[PDB]
């Protein structure tokens, strides 16, 4: 905030909302609950310029979470790469899937 | 420096708190007793400046100025309260507060012993003197000649500051002391070619050096006679007097830099004193005059002797009171026939006796007649130019034969001859005419007996 | 209006503000931002009539506009982080959208031509609000937000704004015009010295304010709103047209007045990480605020312009109006520059 | 046009006080001015202040440095050494490069 | 160092600016000024009227000032503390330099003939 | 417009100038289009065909004065052999300038413009030699 | 004023300007290396108040 008035009045405003793994109701926790914690941990009191390099591992880890795009590109290889066997005649899938 | 600060402030509560009909009674008394106290600043000593705080110092190089701006607020004061008579009572003390404003920048402007100080007060300059010229002269060029004076000083100095401002970064400091000693030489680049260049171009503006100098002659012809005598007396020389110190740090790419100002001032110098034979108006006469002696002095300071900088300052000093002169010499005859076409009022030695001898010793100051102040500076300048390169000597002579040509033109055209029939309101010249003019010349004369005081640090 | 009407309509236009300059959260920020909105429309439209309605509905575009771009940097961040602090974003999109949204806001070029028309089609009590106060919800987002902005966007918004702004005022002479214009050319300086050092961009904000203020509350205390109009003062109240003089002068930047002082610093910041170019292209592009500031002060101050017999009417009645504050305002404008290192108190 | 004064003529000093000195309307404050003028222009300053340059003390040591020379070169060509020597540093006291 | 406080505690720990301060000087006088516009626009006598006035205004400003020149002397005292523990906590980012003399020193000479 | 701007700084000075002309043709003709498209979006033209007109009247200045700075200044520098000297941005700023005052019909503007644009084109060498930013990254 | 207290007041000057010259110095170069390695009380940008976390357990386990 610019000005933190919330700190010095000790009252909560806003920030109850600002995170994800704040308390939530009924301790509901969100999807990337312990990503978003490690990172925050992680870059806990050093400043952004120090947590951008020094909390790398930590924030990947949380983006691949919120997005998954590492997950669907891997998803999209397989499903690819089965569709390539299938008209080729080179796979058969099992019955359970 | 406060011993003249302090007072020079205490001017202004004079001025408003006195009665209605001695505001000029107190504030010329006063001023004066102020220009008298200046002479202990010349406490000098032949190996040390004296440095009286961390703000101010005082060597012998702002010394003779600070003494020449002191001495001139007494004068302005004696010569604009004829044609400020029919002035409201409250924008004559507006006007007399502008003066003592434009004293107080210009005496802690030579003493600034820090450079973005004097950068300040060398800008503060700028809002008196314009007020001066577009609410007190009394022409319609008045307002365009106020833009013209404003923009093409600011466009040379928001330069200056980013160069100061650099400059303090990369050396840690721009206390003038300190800069003497810790002074690096600056080795060449197209980076260092424009950081020379914004540290000089803001005090050529002011000098003017030539073909920056269209602002000066519409200022003068413009500005009121108080105006036109603290334009031409000081503000000339906070380019020479900045000039001077920042040198300092700009070497040995002084070397190359300077070519092409020392160029423009030779030829300028020649080509300004041409002008002035046949200029119809005896104020832009006068401004075109201060032009070509300023050339002389930049020429002096770029090529950096012990002789040529003994010779910039005299040359600084004898130009302020002699052109002051002249500007009020040209303001007396302007009192009584209302214009300033040089040709108008001729023959007047034969109606203004007294006046004519004093326009005969202002034009042999001018064309600089020996031993005078004016011809010691100007003789040291060419002998140390003639050791720059002999050559120089033709174009140095050349000038003072046209100076020589315009100055007593200028006698001629306006004291002999015969008188203008038709103009018939010639009244005797009055005390506070005379007094006026005898304030200029004679202590410019006292100065030959003991010209040590206004050589410079070189000396 | 109601006067408890307007105390709280006013009251409001203060709360939006204030909750966004305390606000941790994005979703209170752009709420703030909604509140004050909500509330200015009003003022605007005051005197009802086609001018004020046209500036209104040309302010509510423009605003409800930023307002969704802002939006849309908010939920873009979030889908990036997950999270809703106000600090720095973490998706290059997410800073453009809302660097933009900014800009718009405070009516930076190119995105500048609403601040002309509204600031002319409303009083000028209006005017005085929308070119101060609306300014520090804005910059109080960019004071948060800027080691994520892109420097090339932020820098070039920078320098059309000041280069729009001189040009724009030279060929104005209704005074809200030439006001909207100033404040263009004045909101650049702030932007462009953000990147380096912000403590300077709220000094420029503050200084910038305390000027426009004396300015605004002078053509109030005249009911004056154009050049002409104003060249009348010197013939009812000769003390103002000295006020406008020092405060003009001011805010050209002219030592050693108060308004150089943000110039300077700016300078001394922008130097000290090796920009030399911008600032001297931003000092020398000043003096186009400085000619349409000094044309100001030769029709009103520095020569005396024809007046009206009506005019002797007016020498026989007093000033009423309340021109709260304007004695201290106007020395904050002229004389505070001896005291420049105060500026450590915004650090 | 407009309703505009007509240029004022023009005022001669001398008509209302033929002793007039050129400062003030008011004969009495014209003299008071001229007084303070002359007294503290010419008396003062110019009088007082000439005769206090004339006896500055020794301005910027040039005496002093006259009689200084006069000591040294008396000292130096009674022992014989060089009036002036080349060299202004001892040359014990720097190290060239290489 | 503490959030969103004007002069933390540790603020106390300087001397506080001396009530003959000639920045506060400066303050007051700016105070007074303002009194004087104040009668001006206002038409009112500029140096006799509403001495009470005239009195508040150069009151209000020392106070104000006095604050505001406490806390710009407390944010330069800080600016410092943090410096100086900063090189303390890295001596190998500002070593001490053997310092030659000009004896030693090679520079090159530019003559101006 | 940075990849058309390494594009320019990347093949020396003096060499290969076909290759320098189509950048410098490149930078000026979107240069160009910037200008028309703000002129036609706020001052709009009374057809399509003239807005067509008027984008292809700035689209061909803009991209003529590109191409001449970047033939001339690379051909001064291979005809000269120096490579690295400022003065060869200057001849070829100048010539743009004059090329600005032909499509314009305006010897003023010919000659003011060949003189600004001169020493700007100069003043963009002497930076890219000494590292002048425009745009500095904040370091302090 | 004598030579002596000149000369030994242009010391003490000399001294005061020299010492502010050189903190000007030293502090342009810890901005600078500040604001590079962001390992000092300037250029401290802030992060997520690690307060804010609830470790309560969870309506789930895995979190
Ligand atoms: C992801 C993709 C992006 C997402 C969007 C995808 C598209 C989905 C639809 C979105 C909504 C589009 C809304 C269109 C609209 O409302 O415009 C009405 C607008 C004005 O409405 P109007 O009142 O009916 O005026 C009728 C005549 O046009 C006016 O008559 P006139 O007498 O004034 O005629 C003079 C005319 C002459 O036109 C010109 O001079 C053109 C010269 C161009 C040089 C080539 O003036 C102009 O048109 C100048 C403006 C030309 C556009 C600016 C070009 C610079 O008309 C238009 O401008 C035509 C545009 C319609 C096609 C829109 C194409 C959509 C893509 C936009 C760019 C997407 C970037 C991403
Ligand atoms: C006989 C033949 C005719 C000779 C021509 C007549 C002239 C000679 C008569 C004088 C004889 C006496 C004499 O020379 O001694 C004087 C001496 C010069 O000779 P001196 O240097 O040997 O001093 C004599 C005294 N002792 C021996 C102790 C050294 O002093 C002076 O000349 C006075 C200098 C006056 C200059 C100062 C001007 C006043 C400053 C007022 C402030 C306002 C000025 C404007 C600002 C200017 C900027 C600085
Ligand atoms: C005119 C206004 C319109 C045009 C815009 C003006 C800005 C363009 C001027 C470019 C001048 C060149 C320049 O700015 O030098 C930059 C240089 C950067 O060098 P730097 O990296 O900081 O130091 C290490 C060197 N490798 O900086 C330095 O090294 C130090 C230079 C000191 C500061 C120089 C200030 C620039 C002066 C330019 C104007 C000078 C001419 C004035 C003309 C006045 C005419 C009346
Ligand atoms: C301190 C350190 C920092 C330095 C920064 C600079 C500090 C100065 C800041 C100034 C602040 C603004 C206040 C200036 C007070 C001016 C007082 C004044 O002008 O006199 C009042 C008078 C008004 O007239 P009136 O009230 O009716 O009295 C009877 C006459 N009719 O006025 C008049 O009647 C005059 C009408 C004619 C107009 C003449 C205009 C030319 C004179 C302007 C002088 C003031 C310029 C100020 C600009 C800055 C100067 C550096
Ligand atoms: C530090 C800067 C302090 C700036 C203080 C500004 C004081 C300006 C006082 C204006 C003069 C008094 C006045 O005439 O009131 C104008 C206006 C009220 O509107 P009015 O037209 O007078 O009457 C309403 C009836 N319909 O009055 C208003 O509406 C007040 C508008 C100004 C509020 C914003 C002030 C600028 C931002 C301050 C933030 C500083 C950080
Ligand atoms: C130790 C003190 C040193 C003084 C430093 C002065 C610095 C500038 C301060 C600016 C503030 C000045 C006060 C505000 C102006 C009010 C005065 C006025 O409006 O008119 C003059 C007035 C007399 O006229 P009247 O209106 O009839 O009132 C009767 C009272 N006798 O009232 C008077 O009797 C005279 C009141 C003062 C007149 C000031 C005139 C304008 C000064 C501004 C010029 C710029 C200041 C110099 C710049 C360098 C700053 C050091
Ligand atoms: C950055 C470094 C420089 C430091 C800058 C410091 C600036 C901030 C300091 C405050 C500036 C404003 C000070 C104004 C002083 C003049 C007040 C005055 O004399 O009022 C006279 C009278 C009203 O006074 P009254 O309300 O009865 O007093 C009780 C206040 N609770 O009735 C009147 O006639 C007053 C009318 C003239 C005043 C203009 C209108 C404003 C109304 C103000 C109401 C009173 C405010 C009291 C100020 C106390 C501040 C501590
Ligand atoms: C963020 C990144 C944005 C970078 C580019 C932004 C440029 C801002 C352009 C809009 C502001 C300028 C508005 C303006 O100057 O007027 C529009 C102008 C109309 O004039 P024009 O058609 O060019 O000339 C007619 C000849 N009689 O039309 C124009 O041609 C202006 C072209 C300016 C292009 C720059
Ligand atoms: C009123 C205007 C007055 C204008 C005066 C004009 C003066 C012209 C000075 C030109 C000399 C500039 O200084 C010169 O700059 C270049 C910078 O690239 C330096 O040289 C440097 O760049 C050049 C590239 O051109 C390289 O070849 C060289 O290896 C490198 O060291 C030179 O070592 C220096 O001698
Ligand atoms: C060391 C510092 C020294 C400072 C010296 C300053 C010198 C100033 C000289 C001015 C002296 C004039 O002193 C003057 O005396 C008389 C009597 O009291 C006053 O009063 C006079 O006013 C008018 C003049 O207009 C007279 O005609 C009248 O007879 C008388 O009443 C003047 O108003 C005052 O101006
Ligand atoms: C190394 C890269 C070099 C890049 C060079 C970039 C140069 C900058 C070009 C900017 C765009 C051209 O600029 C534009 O040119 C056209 C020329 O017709 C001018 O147009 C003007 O001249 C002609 C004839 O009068 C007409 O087109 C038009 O009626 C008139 O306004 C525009 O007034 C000007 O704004
Ligand atoms: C009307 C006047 C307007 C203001 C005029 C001001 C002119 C200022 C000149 C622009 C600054 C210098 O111009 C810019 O310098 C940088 C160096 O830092 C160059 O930077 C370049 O260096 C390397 C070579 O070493 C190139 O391979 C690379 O493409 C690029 O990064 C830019 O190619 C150049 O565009
Ligand atoms: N340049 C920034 N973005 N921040 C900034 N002001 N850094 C400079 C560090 C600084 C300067 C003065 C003080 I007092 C303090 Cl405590 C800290």
Redesign the pocket.
């Given at each position: 905030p610019f000005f933190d008035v919330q700190k010095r009045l000790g009252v909560d405003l806003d920030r109850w909302m600002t995170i994800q793994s704040a308390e939530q109701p009924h301790k509901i926790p969100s999807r990337c609950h312990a990503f978003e914690k490690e990172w925050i941990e992680c870059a806990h009191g050093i400043g952004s310029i120090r947590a951008e390099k020094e909390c790398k591992i930590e924030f990947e880890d949380f983006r691949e979470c919120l997005l998954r795009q590492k997950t669907m590109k891997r998803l999209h290889a397989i499903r690819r790469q089965r569709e390539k066997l299938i008209k080729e005649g080179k796979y058969t899938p099992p019955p359970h899937h | 420096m406060l011993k003249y600060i302090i007072p020079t402030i205490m001017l202004m509560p004079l001025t408003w708190l006195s009665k209605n009909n001695m505001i000029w009674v107190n504030s010329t008394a006063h001023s004066l007793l102020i220009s008298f106290t200046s002479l202990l600043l010349m406490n000098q000593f032949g190996d040390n400046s004296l440095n009286f705080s961390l703000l101010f110092f005082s060597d012998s190089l702002s010394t003779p100025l600070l003494i020449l701006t002191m001495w001139l607020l007494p004068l302005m004061l004696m010569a604009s309260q004829h044609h400020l008579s029919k002035e409201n009572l409250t924008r004559k003390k507006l006007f007399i507060t502008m003066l003592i404003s434009l004293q107080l920048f210009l005496i802690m402007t030579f003493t600034a012993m820090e450079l973005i100080l004097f950068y300040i007060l060398f800008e503060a300059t700028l809002v008196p003197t314009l007020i001066i010229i577009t609410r007190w002269g009394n022409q319609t060029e008045r307002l365009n000649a106020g833009l013209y004076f404003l923009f093409y000083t600011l466009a040379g100095s928001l330069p200056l500051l980013v160069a100061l401002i650099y400059i303090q970064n990369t050396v840690g400091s721009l206390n003038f002391l300190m800069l003497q000693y810790w002074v690096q030489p600056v080795h060449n680049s197209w980076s260092n070619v424009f950081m020379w260049l914004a540290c000089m171009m803001a005090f050529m503006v002011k000098m003017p050096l030539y073909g920056l100098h269209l602002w000066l002659p519409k200022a003068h012809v413009e500005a009121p006679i108080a105006g036109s005598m603290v334009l031409a007396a000081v503000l000339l020389k906070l380019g020479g007097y900045g000039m001077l110190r920042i040198t300092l740090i700009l070497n040995p790419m002084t070397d190359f830099m300077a070519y092409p100002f020392i160029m423009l001032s030779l030829w300028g110098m020649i080509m300004t004193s041409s002008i002035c034979l046949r200029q119809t108006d005896l104020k832009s006469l006068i401004a075109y005059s201060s032009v070509s002696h300023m050339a002389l002095v930049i020429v002096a300071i770029l090529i950096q002797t012990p002789w040529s900088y003994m010779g910039a300052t005299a040359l600084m000093i004898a130009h302020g009171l002699t052109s002051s002169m002249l500007f009020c010499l040209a303001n007396s005859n302007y009192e009584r026939i209302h214009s300033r076409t040089m040709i108008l009022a001729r023959g007047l030695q034969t109606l203004l006796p007294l006046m004519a001898t004093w326009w005969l010793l202002a034009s042999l100051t001018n064309l600089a007649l020996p031993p005078t102040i004016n011809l010691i500076g100007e003789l040291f300048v060419v002998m140390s130019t003639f050791s720059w390169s002999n050559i120089t000597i033709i174009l140095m002579g050349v000038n003072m034969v046209i100076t020589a040509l315009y100055s007593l033109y200028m006698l001629i055209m306006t004291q002999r001859g015969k008188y203008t029939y038709h103009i018939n309101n010639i009244s005797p010249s009055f005390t506070r005419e005379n007094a006026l003019m005898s304030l200029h010349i004679l202590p410019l004369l006292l100065l030959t007996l003991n010209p040590k005081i206004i050589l410079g640090p070189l000396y | 209006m109601n006067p408890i009407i307007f105390i709280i309509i006013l009251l409001t236009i203060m709360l939006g503000t204030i909750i966004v300059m305390i606000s941790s959260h994005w979703l209170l920020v752009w709420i703030g931002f909604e509140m004050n909105m909500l509330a200015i429309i009003p003022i605007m439209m005051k005197n009802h009539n086609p001018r004020a309605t046209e500036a209104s509905t040309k302010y509510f575009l423009t605003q409800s506009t930023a307002s969704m771009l802002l939006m849309m940097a908010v939920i873009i961040n979030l889908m990036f982080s997950g999270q809703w602090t106000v600090m720095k974003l973490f998706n290059p999109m997410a800073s453009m959208l809302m660097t933009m949204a900014l800009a718009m806001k405070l009516g930076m070029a190119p995105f500048h031509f609403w601040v002309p028309e509204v600031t002319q089609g409303i009083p000028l009590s209006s005017g005085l609000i929308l070119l101060t106060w609306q300014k520090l919800a804005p910059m109080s987002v960019l004071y948060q937000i800027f080691p994520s902005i892109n420097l090339n966007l932020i820098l070039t918004l920078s320098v059309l704004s000041i280069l729009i702004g001189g040009w724009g005022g030279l060929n104005q002479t209704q005074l809200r015009k030439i006001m909207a214009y100033s404040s263009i050319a004045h909101m650049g300086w702030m932007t462009a010295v953000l990147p380096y050092n912000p403590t300077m961009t709220l000094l420029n904000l503050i200084i910038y304010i305390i000027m426009t203020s004396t300015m605004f509350t002078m053509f109030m205390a005249n009911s004056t709103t154009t050049t002409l109009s104003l060249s009348h003062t010197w013939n009812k109240t000769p003390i103002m047209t000295v006020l406008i003089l020092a405060t003009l002068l001011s805010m050209g930047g002219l030592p050693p007045l108060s308004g150089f002082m943000p110039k300077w610093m700016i300078i001394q910041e922008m130097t000290k990480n090796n920009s030399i170019i911008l600032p001297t292209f931003m000092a020398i592009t000043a003096l186009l605020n400085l000619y349409f500031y000094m044309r100001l002060t030769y029709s009103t101050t520095l020569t005396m312009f024809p007046s009206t017999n009506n005019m002797k009417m007016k020498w026989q009645f007093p000033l009423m109006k309340?021109?709260?504050?304007?004695?201290?305002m106007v020395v904050?404008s002229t004389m505070?520059l001896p005291?420049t290192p105060?500026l450590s108190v915004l650090e | 046009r407009w309703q505009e004064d007509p240029e004022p003529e023009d005022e001669n000093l001398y008509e209302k006080n033929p002793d007039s000195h050129g400062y003030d309307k008011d004969p009495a404050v014209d003299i008071w001015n001229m007084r303070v003028v002359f007294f503290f222009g010419f008396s003062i300053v110019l009088v007082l202040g000439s005769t206090f340059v004339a006896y500055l003390p020794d301005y910027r040591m040039q005496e002093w440095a006259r009689r200084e020379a006069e000591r040294l070169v008396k000292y130096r060509e009674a022992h014989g050494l060089p009036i002036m020597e080349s060299n202004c540093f001892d040359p014990s006291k720097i190290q060239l490069p290489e | 160092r503490a959030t969103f406080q004007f002069l933390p505690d540790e603020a106390r720990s300087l001397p506080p600016p001396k009530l003959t301060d000639p920045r506060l000087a400066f303050?007051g006088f700016?105070?007074y000024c303002?009194?004087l516009i104040?009668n001006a626009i206002r038409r009112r006598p500029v140096l006799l009227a509403?001495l009470?006035?005239?009195?508040?205004?150069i009151?209000?400003?020392v106070?104000?000032?006095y604050y505001?020149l406490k806390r710009q002397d407390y944010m330069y005292a800080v600016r410092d503390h943090d410096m100086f523990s900063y090189i303390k906590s890295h001596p190998e980012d500002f070593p001490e330099k053997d310092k030659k003399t000009y004896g030693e020193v090679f520079e090159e000479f530019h003559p101006v003939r | 417009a940075k990849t058309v701007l390494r594009q320019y700084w990347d093949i020396p000075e003096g060499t290969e100038c076909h290759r320098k002309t189509y950048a410098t043709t490149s930078i000026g003709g979107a240069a160009g289009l910037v200008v028309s498209a703000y002129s036609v979006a706020l001052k709009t033209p009374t057809s399509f065909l003239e807005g067509v007109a008027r984008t292809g009247r700035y689209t061909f200045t803009a991209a003529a004065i590109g191409a001449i700075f970047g033939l001339t200044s690379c051909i001064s520098a291979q005809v000269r052999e120096k490579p690295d000297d400022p003065l060869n941005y200057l001849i070829g700023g100048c010539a743009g300038g004059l090329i600005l005052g032909a499509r314009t019909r305006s010897y003023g503007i010919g000659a003011a413009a060949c003189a600004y644009m001169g020493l700007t084109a100069a003043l963009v060498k002497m930076g890219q030699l000494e590292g002048w930013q425009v745009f500095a990254e904040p370091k302090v | 004023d004598g030579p002596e207290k000149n000369y030994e007041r242009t010391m003490a000057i000399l001294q005061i300007e020299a010492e502010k010259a050189e903190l000007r110095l030293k502090e342009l170069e810890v901005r600078r290396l500040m604001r590079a390695r962001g390992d000092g009380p300037w250029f401290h940008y802030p992060t997520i108040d690690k307060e804010l976390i609830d470790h309560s357990p969870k309506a789930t386990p895995d979190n």
């Open positions: - | - | 309340k021109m709260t504050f304007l004695p201290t904050l505070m005291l105060m | - | 303050v700016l105070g303002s009194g104040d509403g009470h006035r005239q009195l508040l205004y009151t209000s400003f106070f104000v000032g505001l | - | -």
